From Swiss-Prot:
Entry's family note: Belongs to the bZIP family. GCN4 subfamily.
Notes on the domains: Residues 89 to 100 and 106 to 125 define the N-terminal activation domain (NTAD) and the central acidic activation domain (CAAD) respectively, which can function independently to promote high-level transcription of the target genes.
Induction info: Translation is induced by amino acid or purine starvation, or during growth in low or poor carbon sources. Translational repression during nutrient-rich conditions is dependent on four uORFs (upstream open reading frames) present in the 5'-UTR of the mRNA; these promote ribosome dissociation. Translational induction occurs in conditions reducing translation machinery efficiency, leading to ribosomes scanning over the uORFs, and increased translation of the mRNA. The rapid translational induction is followed by transcriptional induction at later time-points, independently of the uORF sequences.
Lineage: Eukaryota, Fungi, Dikarya, Ascomycota, Saccharomycotina
Record-given protein name: General control transcription factor GCN4
Function, in words: Master transcriptional regulator that mediates the response to amino acid starvation. Binds variations of the DNA sequence 5'-ATGA[CG]TCAT-3' in canonical nucleosome-depleted 5'-positioned promoters, and also within coding sequences and 3' non-coding regions. During nutrient starvation (low or poor amino acid, carbon or purine sources), it activates genes required for amino acid biosynthesis and transport, autophagy, cofactor biosynthesis and transport, mitochondrial transport, and additional downstream transcription factors.
Length: 17
């Protein structure tokens, strides 16, 4: 997962709602 896992939430919050 890595922060990438947190990144997915970070990126899916600004794009892909």
């Amino acid at each position: 997962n890595y922060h990438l896992e947190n990144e997915v939430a970070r990126l899916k919050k600004l794009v892909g709602e």
